[PDB]
Design a binder for this molecule. Structure first.
Ligand SMILES: O=C(O)CCCC[C@@H]1SC[C@@H]2NC(=O)N[C@@H]21
Length: 106
């Protein structure tokens, strides 16, 4: 994983990877995905990269939710799957799942 580097996914969301020291990813994510909240709010991202793949987590404090992405990097493409864990308006933990493909911008 190149660091620093900057990636955007097909939904328009932005992932800035600032460092990957000792394999620990440190960066910032901002959602721009239609159908989701916390649009435009940069949140810290944290995870791990190894020779075999990567994952990262972003906590969306204002939305009472967090998402974990898991995937790999093939050059300038980073295909992933994610799970969004949220505490709903009645306090019930729930989840949603989907995919994302991030493409390197710089
Ligand atoms: O709606 C929320 O609870 C917070 C924002 C969640 C955005 C998710 S993270 C997985 C998917 N990929 C995106 O680029 N945005 C959504």
């Amino acid at each position: 994983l190149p660091a620093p580097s900057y990636w955007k996914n097909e939904r328009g969301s932005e992932l800035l990877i600032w460092s990957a020291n000792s394999g620990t990813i440190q960066g910032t994510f901002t959602n721009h995905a239609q159908g989701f909240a916390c649009q435009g709010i940069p949140y810290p991202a944290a995870g791990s990269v190894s020779p075999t793949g990567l994952y990262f987590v972003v906590t969306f404090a204002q939305c009472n939710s967090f998402t974990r992405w898991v995937g790999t990097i093939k050059g300038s493409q980073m295909p992933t799957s994610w799970t969004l864990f949220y505490v709903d308006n009645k306090g019930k933990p729930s989840r949603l799942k989907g995919g994302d493909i991030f493409t390197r911008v710089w």
